[PDB]
Design a protein around this ligand. Structure first.
Ligand SMILES: Cc1cc2nc3c(=O)[nH]c(=O)nc-3n(C[C@H](O)[C@H](O)[C@H](O)COP(=O)(O)O)c2cc1C
Ligand SMILES: Cc1cc2nc3c(=O)[nH]c(=O)nc-3n(C[C@H](O)[C@H](O)[C@H](O)COP(=O)(O)O)c2cc1C
Ligand SMILES: Cc1cc2nc3c(=O)[nH]c(=O)nc-3n(C[C@H](O)[C@H](O)[C@H](O)COP(=O)(O)O)c2cc1C
Ligand SMILES: Cc1cc2nc3c(=O)[nH]c(=O)nc-3n(C[C@H](O)[C@H](O)[C@H](O)COP(=O)(O)O)c2cc1C
Ligand SMILES: C[C@H](C(=O)O)c1ccccc1
Ligand SMILES: C[C@H](C(=O)O)c1ccccc1
Ligand SMILES: C[C@H](C(=O)O)c1ccccc1
Ligand SMILES: C[C@H](C(=O)O)c1ccccc1
Ligand SMILES: [Mg+2]
Ligand SMILES: [Mg+2]
Ligand SMILES: [Mg+2]
Ligand SMILES: [Mg+2]
Lengths: 334, 334, 334, 334
């Protein structure tokens, strides 16, 4: 049994090789943005409401055309066989069973068709390739396999400088491969090429500037993920949670606005919701659970997060996620 | 002899079983709100006035129809026999002798009639039950026994997740029982049912949102306690002391506004008063004193707090608690 | 040789009995205000000016009718024989030689007439007595002995609770006495009685509220000291340096505005000046120097402070203390 | 190989005598301004832009009539033979090869003519001398030798009090000399004398007040360096990075605005650019690299900084330094 997400990190620390734990845990540069993701959530305080009807509290939301059990999805994390032999299949099975969308990576270590066959609500994360034709063929594969959204990651014109990995001389084990294969910087023209090629909602992941959020809506995006890529891309990039409220106001309901970076509890989900998020992504904790106990581990994590979200919502007087979005917050110190 | 409230915590640490000290000390989740109650008071600085007449300094107030010796009451704390064999009777006797109201708990480990028989100024704290009829019968019992106010706790639709207790596998000893017995979420309709059933002032404990404070006045409450339940309910709830000034302005004298969470000295009482509170509740320190030295311990604590309140008021140029409410404050760093 | 004021504290730590070092170093309550005096100065940053004429840099000021060599005076500190056998005479001699005013205490351990006979620029600090007649006789003694200002301390209706002393069971050694003798709370009426009884400037020490500073000017004060008494009176009182700018604006040249609390370098003097102070008082460091090396120690301290003030002023482009008062500041973090 | 600038500091720590490492590392007084230079950069977060064309990312700028490879120059640091036997020649060679301007010091330990003969883009830093005639002859020498700008340091009417050096009794080794020789405070009249005597751009280094920046433009300066001299002059002077935005707005393109103090990575260069700087100076890290590995060390440092600047710019969506100046920032906590 685990009673917090912190329980699982210690467990994953135990089991994983040091270099692999560092690949997972690390950020770019001095890890300023990595730390700031946590600092930013810790400074947010919720103003709960009392004495409201809680006879039918529900944590469900509708997003991109389908119901989800929680306002949460599993973030795209590449090469999950690094953490457990069943890799993406273990995580996708647990996500399916929990009613949580699972984001299949361009750099998955099991093919996207195999992961989609698990069922559930798969999304597909796109990295822009070489040339437009192969990029669009990846999108077409994902759509043909039943993925329900295209999560276009737009904050990686190239990879950030992860000093832990450089110092470790970390490289992919020979037994881990990019299973979708036998890359180039994305632009707004790339976004349009994707939008024109699919009927699925296109979700732009890695948006931080208010003007980019507006332009995303103008570009026909169905959603954005306000994100600094877990502090792994620009070191010194603002945390998404610090831009979220401004961005939600600027898009004024024109697309779904998700956030990620440092979500470590149901209370953190509540904070993100109160700042205006439609839903959150969760990355590293899902991999901790995967490393610690495979599919059963991820199941326990999602069960824990589900109870924490329900608990936080009720304690704050919210019978629905919509009500949680109307909560006010106060920024504190430390 | 003790010279601060911190003296008593160390003493209680000595004597109590670890699990019981943790039950008392702990908060929910990561204990962010528990810590923030203290941080919030430590950031408040008072601007004292000089050269005022202090020939008749008095710490007395009138509240809910009776005089109190200090602008303070003992907070409701369940199951006080956990901390000393005389439990609630020891605390209520010391409170009586000090001229301080004592809040009798729904979950008291000595029956409310026995505690009320001690005399003094007993209040009764209500948790909403099963059905309206038994809830109202608890209120009627309290009124029949001479309680002078009903403190309706409204921030517990269910109990927060106290991780210390879960990790300890903490459970009530067989020798501790809910002596008032041989629960359901409260709503505004529950508040109205109570108000219609008693002539006693109804005080809503656990209010943090400004709109809930206004609605409390509209609902006929005689008071509110601005409170995040000592950081034991929603982890990430704002401290009451951070909402107090706004709330006092919004109710504009329509009801008494009390505050609790982290009050650990007479200087802290002065800060709360200067921010607009009518009075404070004090929880954990009263239990420290109870654990350390029973009734005599609680007596010493209340004597110490009485001298600290008188000292702080005079040093700040206040001959009355009303004058202290007109003090200005400045928010500092750390 | 000493290169900072911190050098001297370590030296005084060496030589003094622990209880006496604690009497000197300590504050009231939790020492929040003691620490905040330092925090507040450390958050202030100066915006220096460049390329100004520094051919005749002078640190001199005129205050209360006489020239002083620095914008600084020795703060009133009672019972200086606690720290060195020559007590007040050693400090007053060093102050005289440095061209710095020395404040003789009501509770001096050498008689005020003996200390005044040293020469220099003595001020006299008044604590209000028993009855108006003896208070005024103390003032008359001081004036007859050649004191040039009456520093009326107004923040001590009674002494703050110094927990170090209580825990130490600290008491005056039999060999230390209040040499001016063989107390009651002051009011504005007391201030008027003093003002009517002397032609010397009356300076009110311990003012923190803006309205009290205004009333001081209205009352005929020649100056005020913006001060929380070194964190020894109300624990939680705002630092004087945090109120100084507001107070200087409110009195708009109607009286001299001095500040004290935590001044530990020439750079700190510059910060106080830039915030608008006429001059500062320095307390504990003078006693460190006295304890460490008697009169010669205090001489070295004042020489060090004089060089640091001159250095800071020049580096900031100020040829006079008046120019330093026109410097701008920026408040930082930590 | 080094992967950050912090790698090099540890290396320099190894090799240098303690007193020399302290001369390099230290600040004046309590080193408040030294620490604040770093704190100030760490509080700045960049808001990156996405999906922009990065097909021709360039870190080049034009400044003072010539192209530079990066928006950076080597800061003036006196007596570089203290750190390596080749001193200034090693650094100037590496700077030349990297396409970075090198600032030759008035107090260089190799003559300015020898360093200029290395080639590249030498600037010359002026300290005002004794009399106008010799000051101007130093300027004339620099111009005759091919220096392209005069960096007039204006924040040293005299040297700050470096307590590390005093405590170390640090003095120039006999084998290190001021090679340009066989000083007086500068004023605006000195600036005019220099401006009238050369056609080179005059750059005023050590400006912090907005009014001084304006006056610099009015005085005919071609640039300013917003700087508190690495925390080595007035202790308590605001960091340049805290004044930079205000200053850039006030001069409104009237001169180049550079900044220095604490630049330790390409991300830090990006922050300075986003706040409006034309370019930065880098001081201590260049000396770390010099101490650690001579010319090759400085080459590796500049290669590392060049890759970090390119990386940060691209991750932030900037194909040019001009685009980086249009980035927005958000100030955070810690
Ligand atoms: C090991 C690792 C691999 C990742 N791989 C991807 C990826 O392939 N595509 C992507 O868009 N984001 C990737 N991310 C970023 C996550 O989707 C997410 O933005 C970040 O992890 C969220 O922060 P959290 O881990 O603090 O919950 C990765 C993150 C980590 C730690
Ligand atoms: C052990 C414990 C038991 C408590 N039981 C109750 C309770 O039965 N009813 C209630 O309204 N509050 C209860 N509280 C909350 C207190 O009334 C109060 O809000 C909180 O303790 C005040 O903070 P303080 O302990 O920092 O002074 C309890 C608190 C503690 C620590
Ligand atoms: C040991 C001690 C004795 C003091 N005695 C007096 C006193 O008799 N009268 C008075 O007005 N202030 C007294 N003060 C307060 C000082 O005048 C001054 O306000 C405070 O020390 C200034 O702060 P600093 O010590 O940080 O420089 C005393 C302070 C100390 C530490
Ligand atoms: C050892 C040392 C010597 C310096 N010598 C000079 C100098 O001769 N002239 C000058 O204008 N600045 C001098 N400086 C200041 C630097 O030019 C620069 O303002 C500061 O070092 C920049 O901060 P950084 O070292 O944090 O990068 C010196 C700094 C150091 C550390
Ligand atoms: C996004 C993910 C990451 O590590 O942040 C990644 C790993 C390797 C290659 C591309 C992306
Ligand atoms: C409020 C109090 C508490 O522990 O906070 C409590 C304990 C047991 C059951 C209900 C409430
Ligand atoms: C003001 C000074 C003090 O200790 O702060 C004092 C000591 C004894 C009695 C009165 C005042
Ligand atoms: C500026 C530089 C310094 O150390 O900051 C310096 C050293 C010796 C003499 C003058 C200047
Ligand atoms: Mg997250
Ligand atoms: Mg309390
Ligand atoms: Mg002082
Ligand atoms: Mg720098």
């Amino acid at each position: 049994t685990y009673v917090s997400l912190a329980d699982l990190e210690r467990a994953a620390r135990d089991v994983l090789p040091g270099e692999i734990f560092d690949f997972l845990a690390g950020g770019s540069g001095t890890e300023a943005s990595l730390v700031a993701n946590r600092t930013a959530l810790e400074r947010v305080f919720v103003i709960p409401r009392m004495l409201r009807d809680l006879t039918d509290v529900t944590t469900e939301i509708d997003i991109f055309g389908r119901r989800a059990a929680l306002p949460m999805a599993v973030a795209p994390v590449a090469y999950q066989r690094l953490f457990h032999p069943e890799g993406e299949l273990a995580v996708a099975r647990a996500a399916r069973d929990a009613g949580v969308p699972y984001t299949i990576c361009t750099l998955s270590s099991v093919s996207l068709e195999e992961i989609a066959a698990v069922g559930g609500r798969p999304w597909f994360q796109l990295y822009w390739l070489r040339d437009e034709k192969r990029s669009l063929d990846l999108v077409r594969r994902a759509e043909d396999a039943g993925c329900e959204a295209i999560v276009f990651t737009v904050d990686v014109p190239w990879m950030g400088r992860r000093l832990r990995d450089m110092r470790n001389g970390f490289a992919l084990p020979e037994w881990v491969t990019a299973a979708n294969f036998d890359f180039a910087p994305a632009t707004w023209e790339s976004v349009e090429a994707v939008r024109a090629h699919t009927d699925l909602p296109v979700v732009l992941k890695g948006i931080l500037a208010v003007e980019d959020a507006r332009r995303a809506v103008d570009a026909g995006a169905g959603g954005i993920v306000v994100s600094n890529h877990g502090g792994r891309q620009l070191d010194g990039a603002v945390p998404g949670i610090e831009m979220l409220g401004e961005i939600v106001a600027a898009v004024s309901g024109g697309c779904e606005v998700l956030v990620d970076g440092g979500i470590r509890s149901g209370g953190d989900v509540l904070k993100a919701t109160a700042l205006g998020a439609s839903a959150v992504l969760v990355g590293r904790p899902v991999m901790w659970a995967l490393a610690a106990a495979g599919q059963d581990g991820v199941r326990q994590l999602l069960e824990l997060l589900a109870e924490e979200v329900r608990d936080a919502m009720g304690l704050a007087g919210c019978e629905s996620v919509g009500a949680a979005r109307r909560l006010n917050t106060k920024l504190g110190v430390v």
